[PDB]
Amino acid sequence: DLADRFAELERRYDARLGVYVPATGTTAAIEYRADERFAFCSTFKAPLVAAVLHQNPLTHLDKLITYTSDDIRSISPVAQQHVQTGMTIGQLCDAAIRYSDGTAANLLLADLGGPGGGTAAFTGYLRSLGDTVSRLDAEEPELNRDPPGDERDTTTPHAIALVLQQLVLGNALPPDKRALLTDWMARNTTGAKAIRAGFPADWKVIDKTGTGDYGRANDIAVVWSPTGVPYVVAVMSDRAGGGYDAEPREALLAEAATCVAGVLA
Structure with missing residues (x-):
């Protein structure tokens, strides 16, 4: 069965694998280690943008944010190009999601404001959606670095899936x-080799990936069948057995997603 497929993937990639797909009209929830904690890595950037959207009028997206050299401390493919000019909140949101820009995320956290450079408020946003599990404690780059087992900067496949479900499918945000x-x-550039790879081309996939140390690789997605039936898919992984420098293996997510897709088809 499916649990056997997931266990096989764990042995293949020397990995811990977590999978959650919420129940729908006709499908039971898919769950595998779904209540185990995994580091968010960059997956937090999607609900972070939701937090910022929720907190402000739409035209806040047009506010220019300035920053400088010492703000670039993590992978930030877009913010490094615009340090001289600044970026609007909208551009930061774009960059944080579509290029997994870490400086954009840190700046959005600061925009949210409050203790921990915005991490407490971010966590508070998840609480407001009924997520009593996830916690964000650090920003980029530190959040990718907690030792395996540490609860700091973690969510679960179950928790994050329900969050994303409310954000994209539910009414957490106005239309x-x-x-x-x-x-x-939907316009994410970093996810081609993750959940997207496991679903047929005629399925719509939107997603946010994350990778970190200890071979961490995650992807959270919403997918739509060719007839418009939506499913939320959370797949999280780490490879603690390889130590800090263990490589993230997105192929694992692709394979797990392929196994999920075979069940949902």
Whole structure:
């Protein structure tokens, strides 16, 4: 069965694998280690943008944010190009999701404001969606670095799937902000080898990936069948057995997603 497929993938990749797909009209929830904690890595950037959208009028997206050299401390493919000019909140949201830009995320966290450079408020945003499990404690790059087992900067496949479900499919956001978030994840540039790879081309996939140390590789997605039936798919992984420098293996996510897709088809 499916649990056997997932266990096989764990042995193949020397990995710990977590999978959650919420129940629908006709499908039971898919769950595998779904309540085990895994580091968010960059997956937090999608609900982070939702937080910022929720907190402000739509035109806050047009506010220019300035920053400098010492703000670039993590992988930030877009923010490094615009340090001289600044970036609007909208551009930061775009970059945080579509290029997994870490400086954009740190700046959005600061925009949210409050203790921990915005991490407490981010966590508070998840609480407001009924997620009593996830916690964000650090920003980029530190959040990728907690030792395996440490609960700091973690969510679960179950928790994050329910969060994303509310953000994209549910009414956590008004339709106009919901569409912005959805469109950004739809135009994501980093996810081609993750959940996207496991679903047939005629399925729509929007997603946000994350990788980190200890072979961490995650992807959270919403997918739509060719007849418009949506499913939320959370797949999380680490390879603690390889130590800090263990390589993230997105192939594992692709294979797990392929196994999920075979069940949902």
